[PDB]
RNA sequence: AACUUUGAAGGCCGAAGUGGAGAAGGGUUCCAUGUGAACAGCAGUUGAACAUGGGUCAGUCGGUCCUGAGAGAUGGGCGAG
RNA sequence: CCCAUAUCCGCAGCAGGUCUCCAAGGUGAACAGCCUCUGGCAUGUUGGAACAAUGUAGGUAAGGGAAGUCGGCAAGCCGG
C-alpha cells in the first residue's frame, strides 16, 4: 500500500483529465459526441501503421484489421483494469477508499494500460512481428511506439469522455462490439476477390451467392459450394451466427431479482438482480488461455522426453507440413482429449473423445466461475457490504441474513452461469459461428444496454 | 485458488490476450426527504389554592 | 394488559397503523398542502382512553 | 478454557497505555 | 441576503453569517463586541484564550449579576466572563470568513473584523414544571450573527505551531460522500 | 467524550433488595439496525426520541362453563307516555 | 415487553399513589439495625474551583443547671 499508492502520486498530478460536465448533457448532444467518437476509433481501425514492411506479410496488411493504429487494440486497457480489480478484489492491492484516492486510483488503472501499451508493443517489435529494430532503428521504432501510444491514449480519453456523461455508456464496450458487428457484416458483404483454380470469385457470403448463382451453369452446385465453402465464409456460418444470436438474447435476460429497499426511507422499493451469467465471460476466457499455452508448453516439453511413456501419455505432438504451413497439432493423450473437433464427422469417429472434451469445457468454465467469484470480490459477503455501504437492506431481514439469502443464488448462478457460458460456446465453436460464444454475448449485451437507455430517452426525445 | 489464477494471468499474454471481455458494476441511489412533526396536549391552569388566610376581625 | 379482548386488540391495531409518517410523494401532488401527519400519537404524551 | 486467561488479557490490555493511537485491532493475527 | 452594512470596498472584503444558532444571544453579543475591530489573527488568538480562561470577555451591557475577575481590568471594566460556546461559535464563523477571503484571493493575513452584528433569532419553546401544578416557559435565546472582514495595511502571519497541525480527516464525512458518489 | 462501550479499581442496594416474576393500567414502549434536526431542564457517539424493518405459535396456561353478592326478560301489575 | 425513584395515575422520566409470589451468610430474640455472596446499580434532570456571611441536617462544649420560655419546646438522661 505505502509504496504503491504514493509511487503513483508524482505522475498522476501531471497527467491530464477530462472535465466534469457542469449540468446534465442533452441526449441529442450525447448522440453527437458518441457518433463522432465512434467514427474516429473506426478510422483508427483501418489506417495502416507507418513503416512496417518486413513481417507481421505485407500483402496481408493490404488485405487487413491487423496492422492498423488499433494494432495493439483496446486490449491493454481491458487487461489493465482486470489486473487491478483482480489484485484489488483479492485484497492484494489496497485501494484508497476516498474519492480523491479513488480519482487517483482511476489514474492508476489508466496508468497500467499506458504501461501495458509500451510493454505489449515491445514484445511485437523485437520478435519481428513488425520487423527487427535494426531494420527500423530508433526513429521508426520511435514513431511506431508513439503511434501505438497515441491510439490507446486517444482510445482512453474517448472512453473516459463517454464514461463521464458526454456520450452514452462507455467507449471500450462500444468499441469491442462495433468490431464484432462489423466482422459479421463484412463476412457477408465483403467484395474481396479470391484467386482460385476454379477462377476468381467474391468472399462475402451474400455477395458470393449472386456472383456464383449467375457465374455457375450448375445452379445446384452453387447451392452446394455457396453454402459449404470449407475455407471461406458460408451462408451457413451466417445462419449459424444468427441462430445463436436469438438464443443468447433469450438467456441474456435471465436474472434472479432480489427485493431490497433503503434502510433510511419508507417504500422506495428496488431490486438487486443476480444475473445468470454472473461471472461475465471471464471464466471461459481464463480457461481458453490455459488450454492454448498447454498446447504450446506440451510441444516444447514432448520434444525432450518423448521416450518416456508418461510424457507421451500426457500429450503427444507432431508437425503437419503437407502443403500448407507447418502447424502444430496434438497426436494423443490428455491434450488430445482437451481439444475440440475440427470437423463434424470427427465427433462421430470418436464418441468418447468428444464427451471427454465437453466435460472438461463445461466443468472448466463452471469451476472457473465458482472459484472466480470469491477472488473477484463478487461473493455474497462482498455484495452484502456494497449493499450495506449503500444503506440498502432486504426487508424483514437483518444485515447478516442477507448473506444467507444471497448465497442461495450467487454461488449457484456462478457455476451454472459458467456451465451455460461454455455450453453455448461449444455451439458457437462447433457450428462455425463467427466470434465464438464469448463474442455474441458481448455484442448482444452491449446493444441491449444502449437499447434500454435509448428507449428511456425516447420517452421524451 | 490463488496459484491457479496467477498461471492463467501469465498465459493471457502474447497471442491469446487479444480475446477479452468487459467488467461489471451495480451501484444505485435514490431521493431524500426530511420533514418532521409530533403533537401533544395543550396546558391548563387556574387551580386557585392560596393559603394566607389571616382574619383581622 | 396481556389479558386482552379481541375487540380491544383490534382497535389497538388500527391505532398502530394510523401512526406512521406520510408518503413523501404526497408532497409532489398538484394541489397538495399537507406537510406532515398532524395526527401522530405517542404512547406517553397522549393516551387513547381505552 | 483456562481461567487464568482472564488475568493475562487484562494485564495485556493494561499495556495499551504506552501505545495509544496504534492499538492493534486483533492480536490473534492468525487467521 | 442583505447585511446591515455595505462594505466600503467590496472587492477587498469577505462575508460570513449564520442564522438560528443555538448560542445565548446575550453572551454572544458581548463576545462579538470584544473582537470587533481586531485583526483576524489577533481575534482568533483571543477567542482561543477565552476557551481556556486566559482572557475574559467584558460583560458591559448584559451584566446583571456577572461576577468580577482580574482579567476584566484589561478592558477597563470590572465584570467579565468566559463564554465557551459563544467563543467557539464565533471561531467557526471566523474560519468560514477566512475561507471566503481565500476563495476571493484576498490577503488573509491582513484581514480585520470591520463589522460584526448579533441579532436575536426566533426563540425555541421548551417548558419547566413549577409547584402547585403549573407550567412555565423554558425559552432558548438563539441569535443571527453576521460579520464583514476587510483588508488593512497591518499584516500578521499565521502562527508556526498552528499551520503545523494535520488536516484531520472525517470518517463520517466520508461515509456520506460514498452514499452520494 | 466528565456522561457511550470494554477492562481494571473503589463503593452502594444488602434477600420486607436498587434482585427474579406476575395482576390492574399502558399499547408496541419489546427486538435489530440507522440519525444525532426537534425532545431527554448540562452533554451524549446514548435513549422508553426519531426513522426503517421485525416479533406474541397451546386439547393440557387462562378465557370459554358454574353459580356468589347481585343484575335482568317473559306472565302479571302500574303507567299520559 | 414494563409492572415502577423512567413504560400505570397524579399536565412530566414528579421524593406521592398503586394488588401480589420467591427470599442466602455473620451478629443477634428476631423478616430489627449493621456488614457481606447471588443478582443489580452508577448517586437519582449537570459538572469544575473555592470553604465568606446567613441558612438546612448533624455534632461537641469548661463552671452553673430551666436562671430561657406562655410552657423543659428542642435536645438531653434512661435503654439489652
Ligand atoms: Mg402516564
Ligand atoms: Mg441585581
Ligand atoms: Mg446570587
Ligand atoms: Mg401535579
Ligand atoms: Mg425483569
Ligand atoms: Mg420486577
Ligand atoms: Mg439537553
Ligand atoms: Mg429498548
Ligand atoms: Mg405438542
Ligand atoms: Mg356465564
Ligand atoms: Mg326490570
Ligand atoms: Mg449525594
Ligand atoms: Mg452524576
Ligand atoms: Mg429519576
Ligand atoms: Mg436532584
Ligand atoms: Mg456546659
Ligand atoms: Mg462539665
Ligand atoms: Mg422561669
Ligand atoms: Mg423571664
Ligand atoms: Mg421533647
Swiss-Prot record, chain A:
Alphabetical list of InterPro entries matching this protein: SecY/SEC61-alpha, SecY_CS, SecY_dom_sf, Translocon_Sec61/SecY_plug_dom
Domain of life: Eukaryota
Keywords: Developmental protein, Endoplasmic reticulum, Membrane, Protein transport, Translocation, Transmembrane, Transmembrane helix, Transport
Cellular localization per UniProt: Endoplasmic reticulum membrane
A Pfam short name: SecY
GO MF entry, a single one: protein transmembrane transporter activity
SUPFAM superfamilies for the chain: Preprotein translocase SecY subunit
UniProt record, GO biological process: cotranslational protein targeting to membrane; post-translational protein targeting to membrane, translocation; pronephric nephron development; protein insertion into ER membrane; protein targeting to ER; SRP-dependent cotranslational protein targeting to membrane, translocation
Keyword Lipoprotein attributed: no
Cellular component terms per the entry's GO annotation: endoplasmic reticulum membrane; Sec61 translocon complex
Function, as annotated: Component of SEC61 channel-forming translocon complex that mediates transport of signal peptide-containing precursor polypeptides across the endoplasmic reticulum (ER). Forms a ribosome receptor and a gated pore in the ER membrane, both functions required for cotranslational translocation of nascent polypeptides. May cooperate with auxiliary protein SEC62, SEC63 and HSPA5/BiP to enable post-translational transport of small presecretory proteins.
PANTHER family, A to Z: SECY/SEC61-ALPHA FAMILY MEMBER (PTHR10906)
Protein name: Protein transport protein Sec61 subunit alpha isoform 1
Protein species of origin: Canis lupus familiaris
Organism ancestry: Eukaryota, Metazoa, Chordata, Craniata, Vertebrata
Designated gene of the protein: SEC61A1
Swiss-Prot record, chain E:
Record text on subunit structure and interactions: Component of the large ribosomal subunit.
Chain spans, region Disordered: 159-181
Key words, A-Z: Cytoplasm, Ribonucleoprotein, Ribosomal protein
Entry protein name: Large ribosomal subunit protein uL22
Family (UniProt): Belongs to the universal ribosomal protein uL22 family.
Pfam families assigned: Ribosomal_L22
InterPro entries noted in UniProt: Ribosomal_uL22 (IPR001063), Ribosomal_uL22_CS (IPR018260), Ribosomal_uL22_euk/arc (IPR005721), Ribosomal_uL22_sf (IPR036394)
Biological role stated in the UniProt entry: Component of the large ribosomal subunit. The ribosome is a large ribonucleoprotein complex responsible for the synthesis of proteins in the cell.
Biased composition (Basic residues): 166-181
Subcellular locations according to the entry: Cytoplasm
Main location as per UniProt: cytoplasm
GO BP annotations, alphabetical order: cytoplasmic translation
Molecular function in Gene Ontology: structural constituent of ribosome
Amino acid at each position: 500500500a505505502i509504496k504503491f499508492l504514493e509511487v503513483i502520486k508524482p505522475f498522476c498530478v501531471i497527467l491530464p483529465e477530462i472535465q466534469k460536465p457542469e449540468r446534465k448533457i442533452q441526449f441529442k448532444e450525447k448522440v453527437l459526441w458518441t457518433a463522432i467518437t465512434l467514427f474516429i476509433f473506426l478510422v483508427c481501425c483501418q489506417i495502416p501503421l507507418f513503416g512496417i514492411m518486413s513481417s507481421d506479410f505485407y500483402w496481408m496488411r493490404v488485405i487487413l484489421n491487423r496492422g492498423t493504429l488499433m494494432e495493439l487494440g483496446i486490449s491493454p486497457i481491458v487487461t489493465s483494469g482486470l489486473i487491478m480489480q483482480l489484485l484489488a478484489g483479492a485484497k492484494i492491492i489496497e485501494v484508497g477508499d476516498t474519492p480523491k484516492d479513488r480519482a487517483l486510483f482511476n489514474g492508476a488503472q489508466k496508468l497500467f494500460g499506458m504501461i501495458i501499451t509500451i510493454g505489449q508493443s515491445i514484445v511485437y517489435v523485437m520478435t519481428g512481428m513488425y520487423g527487427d529494430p535494426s531494420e527500423m532503428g530508433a526513429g521508426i521504432c520511435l514513431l511506431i511506439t508513439i503511434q501505438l501510444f497515441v491510439a490507446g491514449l486517444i482510445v482512453l480519453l474517448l472512453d473516459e469522455l463517454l464514461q463521464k456523461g458526454y456520450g452514452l455508456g462507455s467507449g471500450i464496450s462500444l468499441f469491442i462490439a462495433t468490431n464484432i458487428c462489423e466482422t459479421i457484416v463484412w463476412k457477408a458483404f465483403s467484395p474481396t476477390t479470391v484467386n482460385t483454380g476454379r477462377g476468381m470469385e467474391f468472399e462475402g457470403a451474400i455477395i458470393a451467392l449472386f456472383h456464383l448463382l449467375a457465374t455457375r451453369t450448375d445452379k445446384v452446385r452453387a447451392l452446394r459450394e455457396a453454402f459449404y465453402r470449407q475455407n471461406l465464409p458460408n451462408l451457413m456460418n451466417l445462419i449459424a451466427t444468427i441462430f445463436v444470436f436469438a438464443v443468447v438474447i433469450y438467456f441474456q435476460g435471465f436474472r434472479v431479482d432480489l427485493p431490497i429497499k433503503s434502510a433510511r426511507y419508507r417504500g422506495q422499493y428496488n431490486t438487486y438482480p443476480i444475473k445468470l451469467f454472473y461471472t461475465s465471460n471471464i471464466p471461459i476466457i481464463l480457461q481458453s488461455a490455459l488450454v492454448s499455452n498447454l498446447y504450446v508448453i506440451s510441444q516444447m516439453l514432448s520434444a525432450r522426453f518423448s521416450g518416456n511413456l508418461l510424457v507421451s501419455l500426457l500429450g503427444t505432438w507432431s508437425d503437419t507440413s503437407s502443403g500448407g504451413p507447418a502447424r502444430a497439432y496434438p497426436v494423443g493423450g490428455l491434450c488430445h482429449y482437451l481439444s475440440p473437433p475440427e470437423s463434424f464427422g470427427s465427433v462421430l469417429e470418436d464418441p468418447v473423445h468428444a464427451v471427454v472434451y465437453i466435460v472438461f469445457m463445461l466443468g472448466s468454465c463452471a469451476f472457473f466461475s465458482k472459484t472466480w467469484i470469491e477472488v473477484s470480490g463478487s461473493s455474497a459477503k462482498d455484495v452484502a457490504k456494497q449493499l450495506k455501504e449503500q444503506q440498502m437492506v432486504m426487508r424483514g431481514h437483518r444485515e447478516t441474513s442477507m448473506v444467507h439469502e444471497l448465497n442461495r443464488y450467487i454461488p449457484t448462478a456462478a457455476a451454472f452461469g459458467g456451465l451455460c457460458i461454455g455450453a453455448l460456446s461449444v455451439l458457437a465453436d462447433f457450428l462455425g459461428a463467427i466470434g465464438s460464444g464469448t463474442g455474441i454475448l458481448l455484442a448482444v449485451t452491449i446493444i441491449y444496454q444502449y437499447f434500454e437507455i435509448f428507449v428511456k430517452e425516447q420517452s421524451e426525445v | 485458488n490463488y496459484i491457479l489464477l496467477n498461471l492463467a494471468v501469465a498465459d493471457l499474454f502474447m497471442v491469446f490476450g487479444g480475446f477479452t471481455t468487459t467488467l461489471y458494476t451495480s451501484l444505485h441511489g435514490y431521493f431524500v426527504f426530511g420533514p418532521t412533526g409530533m403533537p401533544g396536549p395543550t396546558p391548563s391552569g387556574t387551580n386557585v389554592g392560596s393559603s394566607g388566610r389571616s382574619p383581622s376581625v | 394488559s396481556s389479558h386482552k379482548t379481541f375487540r380491544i386488540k383490534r382497535f389497538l391495531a388500527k391505532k398502530q397503523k394510523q401512526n406512521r409518517p406520510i408518503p413523501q410523494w404526497i408532497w409532489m401532488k398538484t394541489g397538495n398542502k399537507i406537510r406532515y401527519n398532524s395526527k401522530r400519537r405517542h404512547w406517553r404524551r397522549t393516551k387513547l382512553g381505552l | 478454557v483456562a481461567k487464568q486467561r482472564i488475568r493475562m488479557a487484562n494485564e495485556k490490555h493494561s499495556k495499551n497505555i504506552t501505545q495509544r493511537g496504534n492499538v492493534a485491532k486483533t492480536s490473534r493475527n492468525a487467521p | 441576503v442583505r447585511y446591515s452594512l455595505d462594505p466600503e470596498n467590496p472587492t477587498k472584503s469577505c462575508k460570513s453569517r449564520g442564522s438560528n444558532l443555538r448560542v445565548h444571544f446575550k453572551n454572544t453579543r458581548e463576545t462579538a463586541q470584544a473582537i470587533k475591530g481586531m485583526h483576524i489573527r489577533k481575534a482568533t488568538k483571543y477567542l482561543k484564550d477565552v476557551t481556556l480562561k486566559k482572557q475574559c470577555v467584558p460583560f458591559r451591557r448584559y451584566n446583571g449579576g456577572v461576577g468580577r475577575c482580574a482579567q476584566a481590568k484589561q478592558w477597563g471594566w470590572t465584570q467579565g466572563r468566559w463564554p465557551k460556546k459563544s467563543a467557539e461559535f464565533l471561531l467557526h464563523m471566523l474560519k468560514n470568513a477566512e475561507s471566503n477571503a481565500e476563495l476571493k484571493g484576498l490577503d488573509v493575513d491582513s484581514l480585520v473584523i470591520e463589522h460584526i452584528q448579533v441579532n436575536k433569532a426566533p426563540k425555541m419553546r421548551r417548558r419547566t414544571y413549577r409547584a402547585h401544578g403549573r407550567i412555565n416557559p423554558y425559552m432558548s435565546s438563539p441569535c443571527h450573527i453576521e460579520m464583514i472582514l476587510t483588508e488593512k495595511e497591518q499584516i500578521v502571519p499565521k502562527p508556526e505551531e498552528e499551520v503545523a497541525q494535520k488536516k484531520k480527516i472525517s470518517q463520517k464525512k466520508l461515509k456520506k460522500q460514498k452514499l452520494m458518489a
